[PDB]
Swiss-Prot record:
GO terms for cellular component: extracellular region; host cell cytoplasm; host cell plasma membrane; membrane. Induction: Transcription is induced in the intracellular environment and is dependent on the SsrA/SsrB system. GO terms for molecular function: ubiquitin-protein transferase activity. Residues 318-601 are annotated as: E3 ubiquitin-protein ligase catalytic domain. This is E3 ubiquitin-protein ligase SspH2. Ubiquitinated in the presence of host E1 ubiquitin-activating enzyme UBA1, E2 ubiquitin-conjugating enzyme UBE2D2 and ubiquitin. It comes from Salmonella typhimurium (strain 14028s / SGSC 2262). LRR repeats lie at residues 53-72, 73-94, 95-112, 113-132, 133-154, 155-172, 173-194, 195-212, 213-234, 235-252, 253-275, 276-296. The chain holds residues 171 to 783 of 788 of the full protein. Effector proteins function to alter host cell physiology and promote bacterial survival in host tissues. This protein is an E3 ubiquitin ligase that interferes with host's ubiquitination pathway. Contributes to virulence in calves. The LRR (leucine-rich repeat) domain forms a slightly curved solenoid and may mediate interaction with target proteins. It is involved in autoinhibition of the enzyme activity by interacting with the catalytic domain.
């Protein structure tokens, strides 16, 4: 009767959904079922009475603006995405309150027996007084400037991505503290049972004494000038992006050590005693010469059984893009407008860094080659966008990382040119670019393989060393002449000799088939022979479907297996490969006609 009035007040598209909710409510009233879940039905209103014995009420994603008075025996309320801007009075016996993804800015009075308060992801600007027996407070992704006094019984406090500048005193049994992405200038004294402390991206300059049983400490992106003694059971130490000048003794059981972008000049000796599975990232620290020497000595020894150690040579401002660009261009107007395009800063920073590289120092031609490239960039908005985006690193590291990213930008440019049509009437240029891409791809795999063999590694130096040292012998036109830190790459003369041999052997064996799968070649074929290539693509699709069905009929059906999602994955995969191989068969003659006279040495 209240429910009938409600069901009939329905916008027409909600009429069936409202009938479904009335059916559920009737079910509660008629069988004593004390759980009501109103479903996802695009509800814009709920009826004014809900069944009165309901103890769990679940409100999924709907378009609700208001909730009715709540069933007096309610123990659990759970509300998903809606447009609630407030909540009704909460029933005295409520135990758990969840609300997610509502524009809600404030909560009503909280019942004294509440135990779980899961109110993350709303718009809350304040909290009510918290009941003393509250056990979990989850209030991340809101708009809170502060938290109220914390109940004595709390075990978990999550409040990351708010605007907190301090925390209240912490309850003695707190086990979990997760308050990252705030503006905390400090932490208060840390409770004894705390096993997890996540406070990344705050404004901490020191840490309180650490609890004996602390297992995780993640405080990267702070302003820490030191860490206190680490407790012996710590497993995770993530303190990157701070101002640390040294580290404490490292607990033997540490499973991750992330200390990149600090100011470390020395390493604890305990680092070498860490387990062989522990992850270690030391990049972007001014490690002394001897420190790095001693490291190479220890990790290179036979029988070394410590961690794999990632390092670099970076050690421990953004002009207007047009200023950065004017420094390179031969006689920049255009670069004013480019300054406002997406990632333009990243690229501005990149260009400033490029003037401090070994190529700049040693190759008098370098300014002019960068100028030609900047000029090509100015005429191609697509390329320019991709290039600017790529600058997002190289700025993360040393001179060689910048140089490496220059090589990657130049690779992008060659593929782009091929894809666009620059070489449709210069097919020897098209084939040359293909060979260069084939060789670079092979170097990437060779460098990845060499990286796996190294216990002390700078993976970018490794990959760069191969590009740089094989530029001449492999005709890598997109690669520059100079690099600074080859001595620390770990790449030997024998390594380079073997990579030359492997790539030349592979190209001889694989290239003619490899170029059939090369994407820019497809772009060129589709331009020169649009009807034949479209026909081949349409056939590739049909062949898959027809081959699927035949494999299903001939192999799955007699088993098995026609419902079986695993067997159907196996034949689907087989039908793609089959159809692919047929597709490349129809491409091959087309490539042979267009390119055969270009594919001799």
């Amino acid at each position: 009767a209240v429910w009938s009035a409600w069901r009939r007040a329905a916008p027409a598209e909600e009429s069936r959904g409202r009938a479904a909710v009335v059916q559920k409510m009737r079910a509660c009233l008629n069988n004593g079922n004390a759980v009501l879940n109103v479903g996802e039905s695009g509800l814009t209103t709920l009826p004014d009475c809900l069944p009165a014995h309901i103890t769990t009420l679940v409100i999924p994603d709907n378009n609700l603006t208001s909730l009715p008075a709540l069933p007096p025996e309610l123990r659990t309320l759970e509300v998903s995405g809606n447009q609630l801007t407030s909540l009704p009075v909460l029933p005295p016996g409520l135990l758990e309150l969840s609300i997610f993804s509502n524009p809600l800015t404030h909560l009503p009075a909280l019942p004294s027996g509440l135990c779980k308060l899961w109110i993350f992801g709303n718009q809350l600007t304040s909290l009510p007084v918290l009941p003393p027996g509250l056990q979990e407070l989850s209030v991340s992704d809101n708009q809170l400037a502060s938290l109220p006094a914390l109940p004595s019984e709390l075990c978990k406090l999550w409040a990351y991505n708010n605007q907190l500048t301090s925390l209240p005193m912490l309850p003695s049994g707190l086990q979990e503290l997760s308050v990252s992405d705030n503006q905390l200038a400090s932490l208060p004294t840390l409770p004894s049972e705390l096993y997890k402390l996540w406070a990344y991206n705050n404004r901490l300059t020191s840490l309180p004494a650490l609890p004996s049983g602390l297992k995780e400490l993640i405080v990267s992106g702070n302003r820490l000038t030191s860490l206190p003694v680490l407790p012996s059971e710590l497993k995770e130490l993530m303190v990157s992006g701070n101002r640390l000048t040294s580290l404490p003794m490292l607990p033997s059981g540490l499973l991750s050590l992330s200390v990149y972008r600090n100011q470390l000049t020395r390493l604890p000796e305990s680092l070498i005693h860490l387990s062989s599975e522990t992850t270690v990232n030391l990049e972007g620290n001014p490690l002394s010469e001897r420190t790095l020497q001693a490291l190479r000595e220890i990790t290179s020894a036979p029988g070394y059984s410590g961690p794999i150690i990632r390092f670099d040579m970076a050690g421990a401002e953004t002009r207007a893009l047009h200023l950065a660009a004017a420094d390179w261009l031969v006689p920049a107007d255009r670069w004013h407008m480019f300054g406002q395009e997406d990632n333009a800063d990243a690229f501005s920073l990149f260009l400033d860094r490029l003037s401090e590289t070994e190529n700049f120092i040693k190759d008098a031609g370098f300014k002019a080659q960068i100028s030609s490239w900047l000029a090509q960039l100015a005429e191609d908005e697509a390329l320019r966008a991709n290039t600017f985006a790529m600058a997002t690193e190289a700025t993360s590291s040393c001179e060689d990382r910048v140089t490496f990213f220059l090589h990657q930008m130049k690779n992008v440019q060659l593929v782009h040119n091929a894809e666009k049509g620059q070489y449709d009437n210069d097919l020897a240029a098209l084939v040359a670019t293909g060979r260069e891409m084939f060789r670079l791809g092979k170097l990437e795999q060779i460098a990845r393989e060499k990286v796996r063999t190294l216990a002390l590694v700078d993976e970018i130096e490794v990959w760069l060393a191969y590009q740089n040292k094989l530029k001449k012998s492999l005709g890598l036109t997109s690669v520059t002449s100079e690099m600074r830190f080859f001595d620390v790459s770990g790449v030997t003369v024998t390594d380079l000799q073997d990579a030359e041999l492997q790539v030349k052997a592979a190209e001889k064996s694989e290239f003619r088939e490899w170029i059939l799968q090369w994407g820019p070649l497809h772009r060129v074929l589709e331009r020169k022979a649009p009807e034949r290539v479209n026909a081949l693509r349409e056939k590739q699709i049909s062949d898959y479907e027809e081959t699927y069905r035949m494999l299903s009929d001939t192999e799955l059906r007699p088993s098995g297996l026609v419902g079986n999602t695993d067997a159907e994955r196996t034949i689907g995969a087989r039908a793609m490969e089959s159809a692919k191989k047929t597709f490349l068969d129809g491409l091959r003659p087309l490539v042979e006609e267009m390119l055969g006279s270009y594919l001799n040495v």
